[PDB]
Amino acid sequence: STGSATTTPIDSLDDAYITPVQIGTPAQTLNLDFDTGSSDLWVFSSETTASEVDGQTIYTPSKSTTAKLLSGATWSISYGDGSSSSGDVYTDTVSVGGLTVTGQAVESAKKVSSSFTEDSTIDGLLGLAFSTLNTVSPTQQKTFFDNAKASLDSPVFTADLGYHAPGTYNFGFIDTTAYTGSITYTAVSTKQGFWEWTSTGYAVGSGTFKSTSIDGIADTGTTLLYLPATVVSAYWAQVSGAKSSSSVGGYVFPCSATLPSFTFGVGSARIVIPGDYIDFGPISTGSSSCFGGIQSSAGIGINIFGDVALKAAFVVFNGATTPTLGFASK
Template identity: 55%
Template sequence: MQPTTSFGTFLVTFLSASMAAGSAIPYMAPQPGSFEIKRAANNGFTGRNGALALARAYAKYGVPVTDTLLEAVETLKSAHLIKRSSGNVTATPDGDDLEYLVPVQIGTPPQTLNLDFDTGSSDLWVFSSETDTSSSQGHSVYSPSKSTSAQKLDGATWSITYGDQSSSSGDVYTDVVTLGSLTVKSQAVESAQQVSAQFAQGNNDGLLGLAFSSINTVKPTQQKTWFDNISGSLDSPLFVADLRHETPGSYIFGTIPSDASNVLYAPVDNSQGFWQFSTSSDIGGSFSAIADTGTTLLLASDDLVSAYYKNVQGAREDQQQGGYVFDCSTTLPDFTFTVGDGKITVPGSLINYGQASGSECFGGIQSSGGLPFAIFGDIALKAAYVVFDSGNTQVGWAQKK
C-alpha cells in the first residue's frame, strides 16, 4: 500500500457528530472514592463515516492510509454532512462515535476543556495559550498564567506523532485537574505549542489518556496518567467503560456497577502500555486484542474478517467505499470471542456500523492492516461493561443483556 500524508489535513474536520438520543441510564449516587461521568446524546447527529473511522484507527497505530481510503472518506463526507453539539457535565460523543468528550477542570480557578477519553494512549495534552492562535481557533484553551496553581516543569517536553505524521508537541506544567468528584493536585498537563492540522480542525480541546503510564511521551521524565495518580483514592483502582449504542452511556471510576454481573476476566499484558489481553474466536483462532475506547471499529486479521463476512450474504470488500460493505437490509451474524473461561457476544446489530453508498452499509469489523494485535474499539465495547482493572492488571467483560 502507498501511504499518504494528506490525511491529517482533514481527519478531525469530520469528527463532529454523535449518536441519536435515547433513554437515560439510571443515576448512580456519588460515593466516596467512586463516581460516574455520564455521556450525552447529540441531537445534531446526521450520519456515520465508516471509511473515516477506519482511516483514523490506521493513522493512530501507524498503518499506511491509502489514497483510495482517503477518497472513500471524501465520498462519504459528501453524503453525510456532520454537525456537533455538546452536553452538560457529560461525556459527549463527537464525530460518528469516534470520540467521547468529557468536561475536565484544570487550574485555579478552574478552566474547563472538553477532552477525549482514550484507553489507547497515556498523555493528558491540551490546547493552550501557547498554541498558535491559527491552530487554537474554535477551541477552549488552558492558560497557565491564569492559574495560581500552575507550575512549569523545567526542561520537560512532549511530542505525539501518529502514523500519518500528524502531531502535537509542547512543554509541560503541573496543575490541579478535576474529573467528576475527584481531584489530582499536581497532574502533568502537557501544553500544546505546535498542533498539526488534524487536531486543529477537530472539536476536542485535547486528550486524556487512560492507557498505562509507561507510554507517556513526556521527556526526560515520564509522567503518570490522571487515572494512575487518582487510583489510590478510589474504592478500587479501576474504571468501567459503559458505552452504549444510540443511547447515553458512561464511565465509572472506583467501582463496578451492580448491573455488571458475571464479569469475565483476562490477564492484561501491559508490556506495550496497552490494555492488551489474549482471546480467541471460532472463526479466527487465538490472538491478542487491545481494548481501546479511542477507536470506533473492531479491527482484526484479514483471515478473521474474511471468515466473518463469508457468513454475510452479498458482503464484499470494496476499496472505493473503504472496506467491507453489504446490503443494509441484511441481518448480520453475531461475533463471539473469549474472555478467560467465558465468552462475550457482539450482536450483529452493532456490527452494522452505518450507511455507506446507496443501499449498502459499512461493516463494523474491518481489517487491522497487518497489526500484530486486534483492536476492540467501540463496536465491541458497547456489547459489555468493560472493566479496566489496574490493581489486578486485568480487563473484565460483563455481557449486556
C-alpha cells in the same frame, strides 16, 4: 476516593466519546477523549497555533492559580490513525467526576494535526494506558489514573460506553448495577504499555464458536474493531454484497443489509456485539455503500478491541499490582 463521569458520543456514529474534565483553579472544563490506548493527557490551549484551533475549548494556564510550568518538559505523540500533536507541559489540578488529582501533568499543545483541528468536539485526550507510554521528555509523566490510584477505594476504573447514547467512566469502584450476570476477568500483559489481553475466540451471528487465541488491546480511543483478516473475512462473508474496497480503505456493505452479530470470547464467557453496532453508515453522504465496524488489523501490527467491541460490555480496567481486565454483558 471515587469518581464518576458521563461520557457522550461526539456524533451519530459513535466515532468517539467525550468526557468533561475540570482543569485548573478556577476550573476550566474541557471535553476530553478518554483513551485506554495512550498515556498522555493533552489539551488544546492558549499556546496552540491559532490557525490550528477551530471551535475547541482551550486551556489557559495563565488563568489558573494552581498551574505551574514543568520547566524544560516537552511532549510529542503520533497515533495509529496518523494524527499527531506536540507541545510543552504544566502541572495543575485535574478532576474527573468528583475525583481530584493535584500535580497532574497537563500537556499543552503548541501544534496539532489537521484531524484534531477539524474535530471541534474534542478538546484533547486523557490517556489511560500504562504510564510507560507517556511521551513527556526528559521526565516521563504519570497518567491521571496512575496518580489517583493509591487514593482510590479500589485501584480500578470502568468503561461503560453507550450505543448511540451516553455512558459512564467510573474510578475507584465497580457499579454492580451497571451490568448483567458476572464479570469475567482475564490476564493482561503490560509489556507494550497497553491493556493487552487474549480473547478466546469468536462467532459470527448464530454460527458455532471458533476457539482460537486472539491477542489484542482494549482501546477506548479507537472507534472500530480490528481483528485478523481471517476473522474479518469470515464475518463479512455472511453479509450479501459485502466487499473489501481498496479505494475506500476497508470492508463496505450495502446499506440495505441486515448485519449479523459478532461474538468474542473472554475466558469461558461471551460478549455479543449486536449487528447494528457494526454499521457506520454511508461512506459519503447519500451513498448506498456503508462502512463496516469490523475491519482487518493486517498492517496495523496489533488487534484492537475498540469502541465497537467495548460498548457491548461493561469493562473493568483493574490496575492492581497484577493488572487484569474484566468483561460483563449489560
